């Protein structure tokens, strides 16, 4: 019943437009939303458009389409790589820094091609589509998927039919993330996606500029979950045709590369109007070709990329810290932070790779622990180098007293965070070792384990710095 779906989505829109609930209400709100999304989903028949046969059956047509439009198709082939999915495998030796992959702009799906597509009329009227280039790309993808003769059909027919973003997690798979820092961004993703689906289902079914959309016929929640997951796992920022601005884009062929540690070796060539990728390392014939996606955390890889990357050298966990207005020194601390370019309250990161805290966090902690006299002396100074550059540098303390205070705080705070997790490090390792787990469950348990391993490293680093500066104070002659 289309009128029942319209009533259920109206209810879903209102629920997901409520304000954020207080501390400790987030899980039960997520369960409230899952209940209504699942009831809608089980009343619908999955993806509106499906392709018979195997995913690999369509890769030859992708290579042929890419070749005819000026892209590189020589020296690699599309292969199944088990738990990494499909990817590129070298057919011949490829040297590091060798240009081996390129994709002309005509092949890309962009916000610009979305504007000139069947979505164009609705794009020009809808406030959300105009503001959210990633949402516009998602609907561009759904519109072309539902088009029988879309130019990008060879690309769309080779995209995965599902993903491992948390949108696809079962309830108990998300439950593994209770009391983690990452779960809050999982909650947000689910609520955003459900709100957007309900909003656009109403728009597509009622707006006159949507009357000719291929989605007015059928537009299921699974359609929208697939579109946003496709975009978040694969989208890229590229310059516009003249280079004056940037835009979001899906890049066929190149986006089949899987991820490894390294540096970005993909850039846009504006002069030749194409994406270009040089080899991250030497790849021998028969070896998988990897690229480096970007310096993202494992929370970001799980939530936005749908995988957990082992030995992520950029892994980190978010921590929120601020000066309280109850602090009798709030005004002076806020003034010092402003001079340093740091907000009074903000989100920092604790890093896996040494050092565990950045210059920004060290600067904040120093200011947070300054005495009134240290604040006055700092504000009286005016050397440009002392606004932030020395303030965040480990070898330029305010005072040994200040160091002891800030490391004591950081040790206690990282220790406090560890105590709030539902499981310990070794409990997690026992689950991973002795249990048969789904792919998505393993991602969740590895993620919560990784958060705690970072926090314990921060505890031990803060403790040794506290002990070091306490020793320096004790050894100072009286």
């Amino acid at each position: 019943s289309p009128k029942e779906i319209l009533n259920l989505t109206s209810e879903l829109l209102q629920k997901c437009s409520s304000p954020a609930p207080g501390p400790g209400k987030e899980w039960e709100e997520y369960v409230q939303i899952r209940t209504l999304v699942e009831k809608i989903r089980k009343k619908q028949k999955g993806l509106s458009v499906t392709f018979d046969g195997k995913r690999e059956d369509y890769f030859p047509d992708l290579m042929k389409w890419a070749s005819e439009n000026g892209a590189s198709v020589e020296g690699f082939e599309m292969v199944n790589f088990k738990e990494e999915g499909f990817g590129l495998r070298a057919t011949r030796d490829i040297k590091a820094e060798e240009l081996f992959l390129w994709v002309p702009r005509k092949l890309l799906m962009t916000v610009e091609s979305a504007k000139n597509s069947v979505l164009g009329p609705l794009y020009s009227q809808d406030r959300i589509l105009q503001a959210m280039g990633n949402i516009a790309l998602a609907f561009h993808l759904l519109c072309e998927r539902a088009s029988p003769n879309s130019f990008w059909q060879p690309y769309i027919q080779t995209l995965p039919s599902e993903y491992d973003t948390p949108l696809y997690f079962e309830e108990d798979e998300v439950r593994y993330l209770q009391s983690t820092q990452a779960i809050h961004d999982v909650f947000s993703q689910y609520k955003n996606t459900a709100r957007q689906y309900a909003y656009f289902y109403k728009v597509i079914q009622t707006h006159p500029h949507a009357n000719k959309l291929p989605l007015k016929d059928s537009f299921t929640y699974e359609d929208y979950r697939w579109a946003v997951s496709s975009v978040m796992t694969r989208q890229n920022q590229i310059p516009t045709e003249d280079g004056s601005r940037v835009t979001l884009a899906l890049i066929p062929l190149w986006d089949m590369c899987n991820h490894t540690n390294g540096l970005i070796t993909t850039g846009y060539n504006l002069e030749d109007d194409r994406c270009e990728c040089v080899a991250l390392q030497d790849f021998r014939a028969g070896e998988q070709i990897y690229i480096f996606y970007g310096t993202r955390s494992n929370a970001e890889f799980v939530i936005h990329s749908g995988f957990f990357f082992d030995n992520n050298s950029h892994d980190r966990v978010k921590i929120k810290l601020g000066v309280s207005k109850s602090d009798r020194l709030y005004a002076m601390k806020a003034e010092v932070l402003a001079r340093a370019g740091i907000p009074t309250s903000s989100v920092f990161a604790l890093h896996f790779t040494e050092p565990p805290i950045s210059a920004q966090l060290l600067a904040f902690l120093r200011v947070f622990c300054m005495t009134e006299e240290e604040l006055k002396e700092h504000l009286l100074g005016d050397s440009a180098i002392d606004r932030i550059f020395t303030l965040g540098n480990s070898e330029f303390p305010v005072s040994w007293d200040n160091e002891v205070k800030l490391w004591t705080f950081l040790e206690d705070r990282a220790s406090l965070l560890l105590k709030t997790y539902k499981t310990t490090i070794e409990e997690d390792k026992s689950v991973l070792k002795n249990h048969d787990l789904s792919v998505r469950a393993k991602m969740a348990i590895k993620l919560r384990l990784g958060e705690k391993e970072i926090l314990e490293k921060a505890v031990k680093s803060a403790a040794v710095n506290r002990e070091y500066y306490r020793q320096q104070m004790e050894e100072k002659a009286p």
Binding site: M132, N236, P239, I264, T265, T266, H304
Partner: peptide, 16 residues
């Protein structure tokens, strides 16, 4: 080095 580096799956804001 790269005038326009491309980050695969760059994180964007989805809060409309």
């Amino acid at each position: 080095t790269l005038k326009y580096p491309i980050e695969a799956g760059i994180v964007t804001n989805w809060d409309d």
